[PDB]
Amino acid sequence: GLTEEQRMMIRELMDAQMKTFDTTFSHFKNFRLPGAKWSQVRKDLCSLKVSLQLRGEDGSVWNYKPPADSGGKEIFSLLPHMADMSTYMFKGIISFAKVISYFRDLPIEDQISLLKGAAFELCQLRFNTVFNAETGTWECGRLSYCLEQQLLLEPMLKFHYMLKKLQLHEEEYVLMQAISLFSPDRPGVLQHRVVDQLQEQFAITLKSYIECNRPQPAHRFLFLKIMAMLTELRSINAQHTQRLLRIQDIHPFATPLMQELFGSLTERHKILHRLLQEGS
Amino acid sequence: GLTEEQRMMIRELMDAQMKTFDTTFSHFKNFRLPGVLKWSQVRKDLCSLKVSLQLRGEDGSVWNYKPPADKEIFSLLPHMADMSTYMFKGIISFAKVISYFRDLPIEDQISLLKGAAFELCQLRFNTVFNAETGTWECGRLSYCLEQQLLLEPMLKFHYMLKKLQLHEEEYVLMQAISLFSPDRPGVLQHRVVDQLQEQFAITLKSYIECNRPQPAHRFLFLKIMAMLTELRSINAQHTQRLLRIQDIHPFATPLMQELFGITSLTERHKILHRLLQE
Numbered sequence: 001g002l003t004e005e006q007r008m009m010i011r012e013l014m015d016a017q018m019k020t021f022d023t024t025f026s027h028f029k030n031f032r033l034p035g036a037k038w039s040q041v042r043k044d045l046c047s048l049k050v051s052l053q054l055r056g057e058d059g060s061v062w063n064y065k066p067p068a069d070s071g072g073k074e075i076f077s078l079l080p081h082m083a084d085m086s087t088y089m090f091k092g093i094i095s096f097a098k099v100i101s102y103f104r105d106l107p108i109e110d111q112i113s114l115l116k117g118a119a120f121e122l123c124q125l126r127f128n129t130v131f132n133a134e135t136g137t138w139e140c141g142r143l144s145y146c147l148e149q150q151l152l153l154e155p156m157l158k159f160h161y162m163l164k165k166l167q168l169h170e171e172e173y174v175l176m177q178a179i180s181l182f183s184p185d186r187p188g189v190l191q192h193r194v195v196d197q198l199q200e201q202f203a204i205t206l207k208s209y210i211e212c213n214r215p216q217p218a219h220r221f222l223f224l225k226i227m228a229m230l231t232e233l234r235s236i237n238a239q240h241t242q243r244l245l246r247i248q249d250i251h252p253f254a255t256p257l258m259q260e261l262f263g264s265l266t267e268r269h270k271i272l273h274r275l276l277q278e279g280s
Numbered sequence: 281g282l283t284e285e286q287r288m289m290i291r292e293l294m295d296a297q298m299k300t301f302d303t304t305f306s307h308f309k310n311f312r313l314p315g316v317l318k319w320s321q322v323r324k325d326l327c328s329l330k331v332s333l334q335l336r337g338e339d340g341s342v343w344n345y346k347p348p349a350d351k352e353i354f355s356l357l358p359h360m361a362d363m364s365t366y367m368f369k370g371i372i373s374f375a376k377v378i379s380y381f382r383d384l385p386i387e388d389q390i391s392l393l394k395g396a397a398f399e400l401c402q403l404r405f406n407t408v409f410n411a412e413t414g415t416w417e418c419g420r421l422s423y424c425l426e427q428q429l430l431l432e433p434m435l436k437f438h439y440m441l442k443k444l445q446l447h448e449e450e451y452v453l454m455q456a457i458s459l460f461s462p463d464r465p466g467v468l469q470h471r472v473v474d475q476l477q478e479q480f481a482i483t484l485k486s487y488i489e490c491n492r493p494q495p496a497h498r499f500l501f502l503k504i505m506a507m508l509t510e511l512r513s514i515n516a517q518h519t520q521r522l523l524r525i526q527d528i529h530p531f532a533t534p535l536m537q538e539l540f541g542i543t544s545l546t547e548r549h550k551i552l553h554r555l556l557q558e
């Protein structure tokens with residue numbers, strides 16, 4: 001059984017996920033729409049090619065088929081839209097962290113440093129909960145992103161297919177979010193041991209939950225599988241971040257909030273600082 | 281062959297068609313699109329006319345609009361109102377090039393263009409219609425339909441007319457015969473336009489005899505005239521249903537309101553009068 005401290009830790013995380021994750025994407029509007037290492041960027045960008053479907057309240061459907069790779073900026077057509085979506089998702093991640101009692105008690109320098117290092121990873125974990133592995137589509141309410149064994153080569157697509165195969169619960173997803181958020185080895189964190197103390201209790205709570213709720217033989221070593229996925233997500237974060245910084249200086253697409261996340265801390269992270277001081 | 285006067289009439293009509301028909305639709309711009317957000321009688325008609333909008337981009341991307349199943353039934357009417365308006369402005373310029381049309385009084389020029397507006401649009405639309413795929417290919421824009429379709433007279437017209445496989449000269453002659461209809465409302469010089477229409481029909485009949493196999497196309501001219509008569513029926517059939525829709529959900533552009541009668545002949549068609557004098 002779970003200790004009372006662990007039972008209330010899970011309920012606080014799940015309560016935070018409910019209040020901050022707009023699974024229907026009803027409040028996501030006002031977004032843009034399409035009107036050697038460079039070759040590796042283009043190849044991975046081609047592997048991540050998706051078609052955008054926008055369903056309307058009346059029943060109509062707008063569908064956007066991306067262009068084919070012919071050399072030029074046409075393969076970066078959906079990046080401005082994806083930058084508006086990532087910013088909307090990250091704002092929900094900010095509100096998720098503010099609701100957590102263990103997070104708001106941290107200094108404002110560590111709150112910015114932690115959210116800077118876990119922004120991409122927290123966004124990927126929420127995307128996997130709406131990812132359709134049967135059709136290769138991210139069902140984001142009114143919006144859909146359908147991909148166009150060789151695509152599993154791209155580590156970001158393989159991560160979503162492998163993570164979806166585990167069939168995690170809501171409690172396990174939100175515990176992965178906490179472990180990813182309270183990483184003591186992020187750049188800029190000062191209270192290394194304090195956030196390390198918090199991270200271990202989330203992993204201990206996750207390990208206790210799985211042992212008390214998943215006796216099935218298909219769930220053997222599930223906790224260690226999850227921890228191995230979090231280490232893999234740390235890598236893909238580095239792979240995708242360096243990939244986008246190379247696209248940003250050639251073809252600028254990042255929203256003002258994304259530029260701060262990529263690089264006093266509160267002085268060059270004004271948008272994130274004001275959002276941390278605001279309320280629900 | 282044809283007489284020199286008939287050869288000049290065809291050369292003049294082909295010259296007008298070339299200068300005023302944008303076959304690529306490259307100059308069709310700034311049109312409304314569906315946003316991202318007898319009632320049963322009319323609803324059945326345009327439900328049979330339900331089409332999807334495809335929009336090809338310069339880079340190769342394709343935006344496709346899927347209309348909704350049965351106010352949502354009139355989602356593509358603002359866009360079609362901008363399309364019909366763009367088409368008519370080319371119809372006006374087509375009539376202004378024909379010498380037999382300028383010499384008519386400005387009131388009769390309005391009356392003829394008012395009665396032949398819908399018909400000359402369908403005739404030009406037919407030249408870009410693909411019967412195999414059921415799509416009107418208007419350059420970057422495509423309109424694909426969504427035996428059940430032949431019951432609709434407007435769809436049966438485009439399929440039967442395309443089946444005749446007319447030449448460019450036969451299409452523009454249909455436009456002239458349709459334009460110079462002597463029985464349009466408000467026409468005063470009916471005797472002049474009747475004799476003008478007869479010369480176009482005689483030229484069309486003579487063209488078919490001289491440029492087609494004699495026994496195979498023995499009734500091609502009479503088939504064409506039957507299509508024009510059928511097109512007049514569809515004209516009143518589509519004008520009434522849109523006049524009903526306009527009272528419910530306004531969509532017609534200012535120029536369409538004058539053509540339908542929404543508020544002297546030139547005083548009730550100020551926009552159409554101005555375009556004729558420019």
Ligand SMILES: CCC[C@H](CC)Oc1ccc(C(C)(C)C)cc1NC(=O)c1nnn(-c2cc(C)c(OC)cc2OC)c1C
Nearest residue numbers: 048050078079082086090119120123127138145240241261
């Ligand atoms: C991967 C699964 C989810 C999506 C479908 C919904 O799949 C795609 C499908 C297609 C495309 C293309 C448009 C083809 C490039 C992109 C993506 N996906 C991203 O482009 C993304 N995913 N995360 N981030 C990101 C987010 C934040 C807060 C951040 O802050 C430091 C940094 C980030 O990247 C370094 C980002 C920017």
Ligand SMILES: CCC[C@H](CC)Oc1ccc(C(C)(C)C)cc1NC(=O)c1nnn(-c2cc(C)c(OC)cc2OC)c1C
Nearest residue numbers: 326329330331356357360364368397398416423518519539
């Ligand atoms: C049939 C071939 C043409 C198109 C595709 C190219 O197919 C459609 C496909 C779908 C739809 C719907 C939006 C579903 C209703 C309409 C249409 N089609 C028209 O909406 C039209 N066709 N002609 N007219 C029109 C034009 C003029 C100058 C006018 O002035 C007196 C009056 C008119 O209507 C009475 C008009 C207004």
